[PDB]
């Protein structure tokens, strides 16, 4: 009974997350086919993704539970199709802002994909099905990155034809979406946990770490373009992305397997990994070596998954499955608020309008400051 919805959802997720053009977005946007400047991409286009994601988050959550999930998933597929159609044939800065708005809509709709299985799968089968869907998405992204690198290097394909493959993949995923069973119920519509201090503390770090991680991810490719202009040197954005994703997945798997009291060792290890994230970001900033910037990105992505995995394990240790949804929804909303404030102040043209050559000094400082403040309260 659980096999059919699970297999269909896993097929949709795999084909939606398989996007060979995602590692080479900056080389594509700044290439001859779009002629977008680095300042325009970083301080006018890219910030719009955070704004739309923050604005659309809560309404999409409320719509999802009430419409029984499936319709939102189909909407996510439609948004994927529109986003890549615009990416393939769009032109100018305004069109890219529309693309960013639709991508933010796509991201805000990902809650339906993971919340869908609750209403169609028995509570006894929740763990394995959720693990299956997460692993399928991770494998899809890694395979897409590896294929993107293989085609660019060996096959010699252009960045235009990488977006054609992504459009075909998302179209197939949408075609898979129209066959999922309609959920017959929902957790809230169709059926005070923060009072605990531990939940508040762990939620805070998760929210702040997630904000920093998403801010760094949105601009890491622009930093690589700055250090190694794509138009004159060989680039390995697919291989680097694939290796970083695999390292993060291995770190997340390792966290679960090794058994240790995270009530006592949680804060020390967390602070250490925040310091490691700060050091990797500082290396990315200062280092003039493109290989060192790749290594720093790998270290940051692997260490963050070491961090967020422990944070999520500590948050959900006592929460109910019903409470997972709203607690984590609030936590991602607050992380989006923090990221929006950061983007407005730093990256936005209405703030400091800082180029990518200085942003990563602010992100390393951000992570170091996170670790420093969290370290306090020890004595006195």
């Amino acid at each position: 009974s659980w096999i059919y919805p699970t297999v269909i959802l896993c097929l949709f997720g795999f084909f939606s997350m398989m996007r060979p053009s995602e590692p080479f977005l900056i080389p594509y946007l700044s290439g001859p086919d779009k002629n977008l400047t680095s300042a325009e991409i970083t301080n006018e286009i890219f910030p719009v993704w955070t704004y739309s994601y923050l604005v659309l988050l809560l309404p999409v959550f409320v719509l999802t539970d009430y419409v029984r999930y499936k319709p939102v998933i189909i909407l996510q597929g439609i948004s994927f199709i529109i986003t890549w159609l615009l990416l393939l044939f769009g032109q100018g800065v305004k069109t890219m802002q529309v693309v960013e708005f639709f991508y933010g809509m796509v991201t805000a709709a990902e809650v339906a994909y993971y919340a869908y299985i609750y209403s169609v799968v028995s509570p006894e089968h929740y763990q394995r099905v959720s693990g299956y869907c997460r692993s399928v998405t991770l494998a899809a992204y890694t395979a897409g990155s590896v294929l993107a690198q293989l085609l660019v290097s060996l096959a010699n394909m252009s960045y235009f034809y990488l977006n054609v493959i992504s459009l075909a993949s998302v179209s197939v995923a949408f075609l898979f979406s129209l066959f999922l069973p309609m959920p017959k119920k929902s957790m809230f519509f169709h059926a005070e946990c923060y009072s605990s201090k531990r939940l508040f503390y762990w939620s805070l770090w998760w929210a702040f770490a997630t904000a920093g991680f998403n801010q760094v991810l949105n601009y890491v490719q622009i930093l690589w373009d700055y250090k190694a202009p794509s138009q004159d040197s060989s680039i390995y954005n697919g291989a680097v992305e694939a290796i970083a994703t695999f390292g993060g997945a291995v770190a997340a798997f390792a966290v679960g397997y090794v058994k240790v009291n995270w009530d006592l060792l949680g804060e020390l290890a967390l602070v250490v990994f925040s310091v490691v994230n700060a050091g990797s970001l500082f290396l990315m900033h200062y280092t003039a070596n493109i290989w060192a910037c790749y290594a720093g990105y790998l270290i940051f992505k692997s260490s963050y998954m070491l961090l967020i995995t422990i944070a999520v394990f500590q948050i959900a240790v006592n929460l109910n499955v019903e409470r997972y949804a709203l607690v984590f929804g609030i936590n991602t909303f607050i992380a989006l608020v923090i990221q929006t404030i950061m983007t407005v102040i730093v990256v936005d043209q209405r703030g400091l309008n800082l180029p990518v050559s200085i942003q990563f000094l602010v992100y390393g400082s951000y992570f170091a400051v996170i670790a420093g403040i969290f370290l306090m309260r020890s004595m006195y």
Partner: nanobody, 126 residues
Framework: QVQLVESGGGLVQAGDSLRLSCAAS????????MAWFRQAPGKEREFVAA????????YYADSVRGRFTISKDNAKNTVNLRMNSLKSEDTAIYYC???????????????????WGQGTQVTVSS
């Protein structure tokens, strides 16, 4: 007082190219936004391209994107604009403007620039 002066505009056959140079003076210019605007008869003043002198960041309007490139020859305190594959829709008077670098600077809004040139005309004949 800052003083912007342009040169290079002229009568150019449609499809050809043209270069425009705006030499700022009266001050040491390292923390200024230097931009180009244009105005044709019966229309409003339109952004063309801008450059950040400190960081070298460049901005373009989608109308001229891919054809116009804005650079900086600091050796003479001049910001240059090269125009390629000109069309009849590019006929206008071009004004280079200078804005001080500061917090919350709208690069493409003409009201942001407090110094403006006398305007050099570029008429494109087909």
């Amino acid at each position: 007082q800052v003083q912007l002066v342009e040169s290079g505009g002229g009568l150019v056959q449609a499809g050809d190219s043209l270069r425009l140079s705006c030499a700022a003076s009266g001050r040491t210019f390292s923390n200024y936004y230097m931009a180009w605007f244009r105005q044709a008869p019966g229309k409003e003043r339109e952004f063309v391209a801008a450059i950040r002198l400190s960081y070298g960041s460049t901005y373009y309007a989608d109308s001229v994107r891919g054809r116009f490139t804005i650079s900086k020859d600091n050796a003479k305190n001049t910001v240059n604009l090269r125009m390629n594959s000109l069309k009849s829709e590019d006929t206008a008077i071009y004004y280079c403007a200078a804005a001080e670098d500061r917090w919350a600077l709208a690069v493409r809004t003409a009201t942001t620039y407090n110094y403006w040139g006398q305007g050099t005309q570029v008429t494109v004949s087909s």
